[PDB]
């Protein structure tokens, strides 16, 4: 939800938070018994029962609305 509530530039923050969550799951799995991180991630993204998850839909929405008509490319710095 936090990723969906911010622009596309929050993708790095989302990736970092997902890595933190994966680390926490790995730490907790030593004693407890939880599902694989992939299963939880897909259930949260609703990608288990749908071809496309929430992340890709939000990326497409941002590309359509906020990215293309607001960002100007610079070939020197890419």
Partner 1 sequence: LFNEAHSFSFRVNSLQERVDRLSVSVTQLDPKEEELSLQDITMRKAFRSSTIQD
Nearest in space to 5 (alpha carbons), one of 51, 61, 44, 48 = 61
Q: Could you say which of 1, 5, 33, 49 contacts partner 1 (CB under 8 A)?
A: 49
Q: Could you say which of 7, 52, 64, 66 contacts partner 1 (CB under 8 A)?
A: 52
Cβ proximity to partner 1, 9 vs 56, nearer residue: 56
Phi, psi of 6 (to 5 degrees): -125, 175
Q: Could you say which of 4, 7, 13, 35 contacts partner 1 (CB under 8 A)?
A: 35
Tell the smallest beta-carbon distance from residue 34 to partner 1 (Å).
11
CA separation (Å) from 39 to 36, 49, 74? 5, 12, 39
């Amino acid at each position: 939800g936090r990723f969906e509530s911010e622009d596309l530039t929050s993708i790095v923050e989302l990736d970092g938070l997902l890595e933190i969550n994966r680390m926490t799951h790995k730490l907790l799995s030593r004693y407890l018994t939880l599902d694989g991180f992939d299963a939880m991630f897909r259930e949260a993204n609703h990608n288990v029962s749908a071809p496309y998850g929430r992340i890709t839909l939000h990326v497409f929405w941002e590309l359509n609305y906020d990215f293309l008509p607001n960002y100007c490319y610079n070939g020197s710095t890419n």
